[PDB]
Amino acid sequence: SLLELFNSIATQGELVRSLKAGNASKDEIDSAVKMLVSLKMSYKAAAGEDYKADCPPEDFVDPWTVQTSSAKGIDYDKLIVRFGSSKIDKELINRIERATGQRPHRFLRRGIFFSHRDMNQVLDAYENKKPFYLYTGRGPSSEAMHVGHLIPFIFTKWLQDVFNVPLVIQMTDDEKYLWKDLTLDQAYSYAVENAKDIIACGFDINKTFIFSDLDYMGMSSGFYKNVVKIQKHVTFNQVKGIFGFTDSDCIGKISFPAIQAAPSFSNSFPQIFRDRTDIQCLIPCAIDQDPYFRMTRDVAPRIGYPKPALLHSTFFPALQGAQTKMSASDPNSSIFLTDTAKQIKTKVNKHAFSGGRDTIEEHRQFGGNCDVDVSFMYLTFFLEDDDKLEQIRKDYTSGAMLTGELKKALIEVLQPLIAEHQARRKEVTDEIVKEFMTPRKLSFDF
Amino acid sequence: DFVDPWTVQTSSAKGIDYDKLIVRFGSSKIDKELINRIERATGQRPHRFLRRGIFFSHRDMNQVLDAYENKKPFYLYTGRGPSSEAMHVGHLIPFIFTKWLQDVFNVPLVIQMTDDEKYLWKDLTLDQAYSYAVENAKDIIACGFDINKTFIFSDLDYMGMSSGFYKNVVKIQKHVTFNQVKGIFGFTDSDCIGKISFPAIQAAPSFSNSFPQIFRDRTDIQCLIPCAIDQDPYFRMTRDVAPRIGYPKPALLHSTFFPALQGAQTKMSASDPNSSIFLTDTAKQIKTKVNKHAFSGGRDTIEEHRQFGGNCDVDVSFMYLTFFLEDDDKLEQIRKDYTSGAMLTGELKKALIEVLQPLIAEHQARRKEVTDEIVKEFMTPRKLSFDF
Numbered sequence: 047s048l049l050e051l052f053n054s055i056a057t058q059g060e061l062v063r064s065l066k067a068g069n070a071s072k073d074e075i076d077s078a079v080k081m082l083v084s085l086k087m088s089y090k091a092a093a094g095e096d097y098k099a100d101c102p103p104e105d106f107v108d109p110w111t112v113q114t115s116s117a118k119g120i121d122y123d124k125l126i127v128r129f130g131s132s133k134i135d136k137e138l139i140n141r142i143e144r145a146t147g148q149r150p151h152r153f154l155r156r157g158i159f160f161s162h163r164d165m166n167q168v169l170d171a172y173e174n175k176k177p178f179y180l181y182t183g184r185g186p187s188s189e190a191m192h193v194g195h196l197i198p199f200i201f202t203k204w205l206q207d208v209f210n211v212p213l214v215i216q217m218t219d220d221e222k223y224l225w226k227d228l229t230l231d232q233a234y235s236y237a238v239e240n241a242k243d244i245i246a247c248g249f250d251i252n253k254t255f256i257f258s259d260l261d262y263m264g265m266s267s268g269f270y271k272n273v274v275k276i277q278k279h280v281t282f283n284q285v286k287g288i289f290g291f292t293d294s295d296c297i298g299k300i301s302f303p304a305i306q307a308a309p310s311f312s313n314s315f316p317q318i319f320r321d322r323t324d325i326q327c328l329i330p331c332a333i334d335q336d337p338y339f340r341m342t343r344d345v346a347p348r349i350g351y352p353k354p355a356l357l358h359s360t361f362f363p364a365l366q367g368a369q370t371k372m373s374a375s376d377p378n379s380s381i382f383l384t385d386t387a388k389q390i391k392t393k394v395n396k397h398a399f400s401g402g403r404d405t406i407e408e409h410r411q412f413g414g415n416c417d418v419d420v421s422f423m424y425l426t427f428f429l430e431d432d433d434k435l436e437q438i439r440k441d442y443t444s445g446a447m448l449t450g451e452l453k454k455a456l457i458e459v460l461q462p463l464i465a466e467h468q469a470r471r472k473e474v475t476d477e478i479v480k481e482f483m484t485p486r487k488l489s490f491d492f
Numbered sequence: 493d494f495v496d497p498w499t500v501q502t503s504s505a506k507g508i509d510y511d512k513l514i515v516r517f518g519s520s521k522i523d524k525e526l527i528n529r530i531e532r533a534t535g536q537r538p539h540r541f542l543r544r545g546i547f548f549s550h551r552d553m554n555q556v557l558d559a560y561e562n563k564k565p566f567y568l569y570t571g572r573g574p575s576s577e578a579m580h581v582g583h584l585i586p587f588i589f590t591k592w593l594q595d596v597f598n599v600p601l602v603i604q605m606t607d608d609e610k611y612l613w614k615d616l617t618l619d620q621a622y623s624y625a626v627e628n629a630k631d632i633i634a635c636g637f638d639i640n641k642t643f644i645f646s647d648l649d650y651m652g653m654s655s656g657f658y659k660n661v662v663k664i665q666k667h668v669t670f671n672q673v674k675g676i677f678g679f680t681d682s683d684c685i686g687k688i689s690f691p692a693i694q695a696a697p698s699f700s701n702s703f704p705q706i707f708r709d710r711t712d713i714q715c716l717i718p719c720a721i722d723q724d725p726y727f728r729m730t731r732d733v734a735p736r737i738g739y740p741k742p743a744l745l746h747s748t749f750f751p752a753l754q755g756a757q758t759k760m761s762a763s764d765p766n767s768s769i770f771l772t773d774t775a776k777q778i779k780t781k782v783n784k785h786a787f788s789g790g791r792d793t794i795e796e797h798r799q800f801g802g803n804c805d806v807d808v809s810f811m812y813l814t815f816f817l818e819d820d821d822k823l824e825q826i827r828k829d830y831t832s833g834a835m836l837t838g839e840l841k842k843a844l845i846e847v848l849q850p851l852i853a854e855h856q857a858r859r860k861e862v863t864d865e866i867v868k869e870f871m872t873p874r875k876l877s878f879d880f
């Protein structure tokens with residue numbers, strides 16, 4: 047009865063947490079909160095103490111949705127053909143190894159970063175001592191990013207280290223203002239807090255410019271000019287086809303794709319690239335962002351600029367299964383970078399979908415299915431040793447390793463990952479975030 | 493019959509029915525009581541445009557005067573789409589009036605040069621559109637605006653030099669749907685996304701915290717927008733969105749159109765060179781355009797002119813005199829004599845030429861004194877001679 051009241055508060059609290067992360071209105075959030083407050087006040091009177099969460103007593107891929115009915119997840123090979131991108135083959139990976147002299151990142155080795163556009167052109171430029179730069183971004187939809195968001199940022203940090211190039215990181219607080227029910231100050235504050243998470247991945251302050259759109263649009267001699275250029279060469283019909291917008295949407299949403307396109311061109315950042323328009327751009331992202339840059343690549347030559355190159359990642363799946371991606375707006379979907387060791391353990395054991403059989407004795411006989419097991423999927427992203435991953439795959443598949451064992455292994459990887467990130471995030475002072483976010487000349491001459 | 497920012501058209505030779513237009517647009521007619529209130533507030537004789545019903549319609553001008561009489565601040569906002577260096581005397585109508593408003597009320601002024609607009613609509617580069625904004629700014633400065641109280645700005649330049657302007661553009665963009673701009677401006681889904689979002693950029697200068705070096709974080713300062721009535725749809729949209737984003741509605745003063753040379757059925761516009769008397773025209777070119785091309789309301793043949801009489805309601809040369817002939821009594825005498833048949837078109841047109849020649853010549857002389865340093869200073873974000 048009192049335990050049943052506790053669980054109802056935990057369920058409703060998680061629902062309230064998910065609503066704040068998604069595109070719900072403040073009035074919808076307030077209504078959910080009023081239920082939560084009502085249950086907690088009933089618990090306080092019944093239990094004689096406050097509630098604390100610790101103590102019981104056809105595949106669709108676009109920027110906003112990843113959905114499939116398959117338990118195995120998105121058919122990434124079919125997605126390449128549909129989007130018209132190029133498969134990252136062994137020959138391209140070997141070329142990156144030759145050019146950098148570094149072991150290919152595990153995401154490349156395991157086909158996590160699996161698709162590209164014009165990556166050979168980036169390597170042509172690099173091998174001929176011509177400059178290029180990295181561009182990625184974050185829509186600061188709430189405070190606290192999740193482990194899924196580490197996939198593009200870890201890879202971008204690796205690319206920056208091995209190629210030694212400047213990086214621009216777009217914080218689209220204007221996007222989030224347009225799509226969510228937020229004030230401008232709330233959207234900007236989420237961008238600053240999310241920048242601290244991004245900085246905690248270990249990007250070099252001498253080589254990295256992280257910018258708020260709301261701030262940078264008002265202080266740049268090139269950025270708005272490029273936005274206007276891009277806006278002339280994209281129609282509403284085109285963005286309706288690409289992004290699924292309708293005439294009931296606000297004009298800000300309709301025009302926003304040009305703002306995400308604009309950082310692809312070097313003269314958007316005149317203080318970094320000495321007013322030059324010919325610096326190759328490379329854009330690491332998960333493949334859901336590709337519609338923005340398919341559009342950007344079509345526009346590029348019409349305004350006299352080179353097309354940006356792409357590197358596309360797979361999706362870090364939701365805890366409930368590979369049917370959806372990990373998303374802050376879905377209940378019990380995410381492992382956040384603010385989660386404690388307890389909460390990481392709890393989420394993996396309670397919520398991570400198992401491909402193992404229902405009983406232990408059945409598991410010994412028939413074995414597990416790694417193609418649907420979420421815990422094994424997470425190990426493909428974060429277990430560093432390739433031989434250990436394969437050993438775990440074989441043993442789980444044969445039945446020699448149980449679900450409990452597989453989850454213990456994962457928890458021992460995710461706990462230090464998130465803890466070390468938190469340790470680095472605490473070192474990020476207000477002075478450091480400001481410096482990362484101040485328009486300035488980076489340590490590169492052009 | 494049809495009036496929007498891109499076209500003014502009517503089958504009538506008398507021109508636009510301005511009284512019916514007030515009713516359709518939902519604006520307010522300027523009456524003598526309002527003109528008297530402006531006189532008492534300023535302590536100056538009302539401008540000939542007000543006296544003769546050229547500036548004829550308004551929105552919330554009583555609220556502007558309420559604020560002004562109670563010693564509250566207001567500011568002026570107008571603009572120019574720099575399509576080319578080729579401006580004409582019809583463009584002087586809003587800027588001459590705005591300059592008078594600045595003097596008599598003693599208020600700050602912002603002038604928007606929409607080079608981004610003309611890039612989006614016309615076959616121009618960014619630098620070409622910007623260059624026209626600079627050249628047009630010299631023509632605007634030549635009307636005599638006070639450098640200590642006037643901020644002229646390129647959208648392309650100023651968007652990147654403002655902690656306030658883009659933030660307001662985004663606020664407006666969030667609260668205006670595509671269905672609304674389709675309904676207001678007649679845009680279609682084949683239009684570029686820049687055209688669809690542009691009305692937010694023309695809306696943004698209506699709100700004072702767009703200009704932080706002039707007004708800081710103040711969101712309460714009354715705005716007043718002089719224009720010809722073709723711009724009204726932009727500010728119908730602005731007035732509707734304002735309360736939805738916690739800002740006051742901008743007030744308006746609407747002018748009539750300086751008609752085309754060939755007739756009042758169309759307004760004077762640079763897009764058709766034959767309709768326009770340009771500000772770059774010489775004395776000789778002003779004679780030729782008035783004599784040969786300015787439509788006559790008089791009868792063909794001299795005998796019929798004295799028998800039947802002239803028609804001031806369709807005569808373009810008389811219409812131009814109502815805008816620029818300074819004496820009211822002489823205008824009425826010319827109206828009487830032309831209507832009765834005493835004055836012929838030739839005599840009417842000759843009197844018009846004697847007003848337009850020194851009008852344009854003096855403007856050309858004042859424009860020549862506008863240096864590169866003055867236009868630069870006008871266009872630099874800075875604090876004006878006002879405290880808030």
Ligand SMILES: Nc1ncnc2c1ncn2[C@@H]1O[C@H](COP(=O)(O)OC(=O)[C@@H](N)Cc2c[nH]c3ccccc23)[C@@H](O)[C@H]1O
Pocket residue numbers: 181182183184185186187194195197198216218221306329330331332333334335359360361362363371372373
């Ligand atoms: N479950 C997941 N697994 C793997 N990757 C994921 C997962 N969820 C999100 N991502 C990727 O993380 C980045 C940020 O996502 P956003 O939705 O904030 O992303 C956004 O809202 C953009 N509008 C911000 C942006 C601006 N410019 C860019 C350039 C590249 C990438 C992103 C941007 C993205 O790379 C996204 O693909």
Ligand SMILES: Nc1ncnc2c1ncn2[C@@H]1O[C@H](COP(=O)(O)OC(=O)[C@@H](N)Cc2c[nH]c3ccccc23)[C@@H](O)[C@H]1O
Pocket residue numbers: 569570571572573574582583585586604606609694717718719720721722723747748749750751759760761
């Ligand atoms: N034949 C005529 N007779 C009398 N007045 C006329 C005639 N033709 C034009 N006007 C007025 O001149 C100003 C500039 O016109 P634009 O078409 O450049 O105007 C434009 O292209 C705007 N998008 C620029 C703008 C931005 N903000 C503003 C605020 C007020 C007025 C104008 C603006 C206008 O006042 C216009 O009403």
Ligand SMILES: [Mg+2]
Pocket residue numbers: 184185186187
């Ligand atoms: Mg997001």
Ligand SMILES: [Mg+2]
Pocket residue numbers: 109110185187
């Ligand atoms: Mg998103």
Ligand SMILES: [Mg+2]
Pocket residue numbers: 497722
């Ligand atoms: Mg006009």
